[PDB]
Design a protein around this ligand. Structure first.
Ligand SMILES: O=c1[nH]c2sccc2c2cc(O)ccc12
Lengths: 192, 198
């Protein structure tokens, strides 16, 4: 369980509200305000989910071996409705719950995830967006109807890309197709 | 730390090992199969050694063993497959997104049978162009389960007022389970592949 996490009194899940103006809060706030400076942050919470973290770190170690080094991780955004926040905190992102495939979608820019279509305002005008560690690894352009990423070579049809995107040269979204390829690290509660 | 009975894979992450009749390992699987599939004949039984699937499954098992109260969370179950799906399952395991709709649906997930006879149906273990049928023997994390329902995309909550605290799997009948449905990756490890014929 990582350093920057705070003690959980032998619990396996907790949401920890960050202290405004300390380094961790400022770092996450800056990633958001890069594209969402007109939105007001009410709070940022650190998601401390020991089981999801363990499963994600195992997939990371595997992808690091498979891809032979490489930076396989990106920090991306995911807007969700308030009704899905308890499920995601506890269980992460579930493809079963889609222009570039039937997976979970993550945005490069908070502004994309800040659309009311993704971060639906609740009865109080509050919107919710995760900052997500995503194992994007080696990626290719996606297409409608994919249930997994395409093969890297159709001569070896089981050796797959790790994720797909809208644009390989200048990506703005990534889609992953497997559980435990995405770890929800922070939850931003904000208003337009 | 892979199991010590596995063949040395000499840095490789994946291997199928052909078992020898007369070995306890072959005989236990043959017996489990023939209990309900005495009319079919086994061509061969291969042990599936998939390091990454094993690691991810064992992490999930350790988590369910912690979460549940001294429960036997693991059952050894059957899964019939078409020949076209065998390479993908061997490497990547069981993907709910690829699953057929079952004739009796208890949810949208991967189905595992208690009896080899269920999986031996041509609808599940489709005979290939050479008349070979394929069935996996699978370690499945059934955990704490309840009767499923066709609408499910995740197992249902144990308690309607705590929607995120889920059953581990669902079944057709809690009193006499004959099938189990799982809704998450790395909840099922394909351990053996039985190749068999009429
Ligand atoms: O942030 C997103 N949340 C959601 S919820 C379901 C779809 C999406 C989505 C799709 C994208 O292409 C890019 C971002 C997001």
């Amino acid at each position: 369980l990582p350093e920057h996490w705070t003690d959980m009194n032998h619990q396996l899940f907790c949401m920890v509200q960050l202290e405004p103006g300390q380094s961790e809060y400022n770092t996450i706030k800056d990633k958001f305000t890069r594209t969402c400076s007109s939105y007001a942050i009410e709070k940022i919470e650190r998601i401390q989910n020991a089981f999801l973290w363990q499963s994600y770190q195992v997939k990371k170690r595997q992808m690091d071996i498979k891809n032979d080094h490489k930076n396989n991780e990106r920090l991306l955004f995911h807007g969700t409705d308030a009704d899905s926040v308890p499920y995601v905190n506890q269980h992460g992102f579930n493809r079963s719950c889609v222009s570039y495939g039937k997976g979970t979608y993550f945005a490069v820019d908070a502004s994309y995830s800040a659309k009311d279509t993704y971060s639906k305002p609740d009865s109080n005008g509050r919107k919710h967006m995760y900052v997500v560690r995503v194992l994007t690894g080696v990626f290719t352009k996606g297409r409608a109807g994919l249930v997994t990423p395409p093969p890297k070579n159709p001569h070896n049809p089981t050796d797959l890309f790790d994720s797909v995107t809208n644009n390989t040269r200048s990506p703005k979204l990534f889609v992953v197709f497997f559980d435990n390829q995405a770890y929800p690290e922070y939850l931003i509660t904000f208003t337009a």
